[PDB]
Design a protein around this ligand. Sequence first.
Ligand code: HEM
Ligand SMILES: O=C(N[C@@H](Cn1ccnc1)c1ccc(Cl)cc1Cl)c1ccc(-c2nnc(-c3ccccc3)o2)cc1
Length: 450
Amino acid sequence: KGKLPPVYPVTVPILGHIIQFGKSPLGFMQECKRQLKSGIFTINIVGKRVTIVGDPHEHSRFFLPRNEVLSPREVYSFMVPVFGEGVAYAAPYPRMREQLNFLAEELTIAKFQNFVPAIQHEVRKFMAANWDKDEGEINLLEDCSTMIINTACQCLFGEDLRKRLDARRFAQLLAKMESSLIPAAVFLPILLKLPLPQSARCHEARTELQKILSEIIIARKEEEVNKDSSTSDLLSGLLSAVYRDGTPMSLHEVCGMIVAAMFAGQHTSSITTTWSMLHLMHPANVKHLEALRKEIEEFPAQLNYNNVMDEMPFAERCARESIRRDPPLLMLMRKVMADVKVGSYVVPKGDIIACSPLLSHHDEEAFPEPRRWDPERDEKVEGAFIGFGAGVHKCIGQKFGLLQVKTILATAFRSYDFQLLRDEVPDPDYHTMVVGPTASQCRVKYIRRK
Ligand code: HEM
Ligand SMILES: O=C(N[C@@H](Cn1ccnc1)c1ccc(Cl)cc1Cl)c1ccc(-c2nnc(-c3ccccc3)o2)cc1
């Protein structure tokens, strides 16, 4: 056609479709697609046009154009109080890319040397403290989420940082920053300009984190004179980065990339672990639990890099399929800065364009019987899996996240079995920013494998 995507009619004035979307994100999107006879279509969120790239065959039209054409900056305006002014997506595109590359470099597999033991240490410490009886009842999502913050901190931060800012206090500062976020501001940008009590809190937590970082940096320069230590961590990595123009990252920027890394990795990784365990313990999946048991059957007590990286293909499939079925990020978005072709249409300058892992992961051609968790499945449409994104803004933490998931799975199932206290795997809870299993349905019985 070369014209605009078909518009889905608005029946609710002012609000547009946001209500029907919350009620049933997948159901609503699939209904639009059916009724409009197009995988590319435009919905309306509080007056803003959102064009969905809902055909897995057209994913490349979303993930591949340059920032200058499809930009994430405006979509992330509401996180500026957390990352900081001029940090990540708020910085000019070449500088954004530089800061993101500096972070990515700290999460490459060449940094993973002592991560496996760090993760195992923290996981065993947690299990010993909280899974300390022959059997007992626990909330698996809460416990996975506590292990992820502990493990991430143990891997990424040297012992000195941890003595001043341990995983508990770090989680508290981050939860105070996160608590302040108003993602509605994507569609109601007037919010970003208002005095809100949120802003004061957020600024508070961030400035306290940045104070702690500066104090750590000053202390480290002193251990440098003494040659007591030479700590190599996430912080030292970003500290040594130098931009193309010859200058270093400011403290502001360093702090902001640390916050982005920690925000990003916490919920997604915790959720992926939780789903993966929930599926593995369910009676319908005994064959898959068997397979994981076989994979790890001959592993040593103290795992190494090679065991997790190279000898857990099935665990990795489990993690990936969990993300496939229940993607923690439902909608990836960009601001359209200039007219782009998508499918047989032109998406106009000023639209938000979106591509939905939720929608695409449930395309029946790409993923037959998509509600069936099957780690042995393989995509049947090229590039249909987008749980880690793709192209210009593809996930830079994927290997680190999967490292943690797989290690937790090997560590946990070595020492325990688990029983779901429900007939079914929990329902996904779509009411949060990062989507996981319904927290109240995640009660499980652990059983110590004596
Ligand atoms: C299993 C866990 C994870 C999942 C499912 C996940 C998913 C994703 C997705 C879907 C995107 C693309 C976002 C978009 O298109 O707008 C993304 C990008 C990103 N992820 Fe992850 N992520 C995970 C773990 C992590 C971790 C552990 C980190 C950091 C430690 C991280 C850092 C990032 C960053 C910084 C981006 C932005 C990259 C850019 O704009 O170039 N992620 N991730
Ligand atoms: O968590 C959000 N963004 C993270 C995503 N992430 C996590 C791990 N890897 C990526 C993020 C990305 C890049 C960077 Cl530098 C930092 C972080 Cl913390 C996030 C942000 C916004 C939304 C969001 N905004 N609007 C919606 C929305 C709107 C309508 C319907 C459904 C969702 O979601 C969702 C997740």
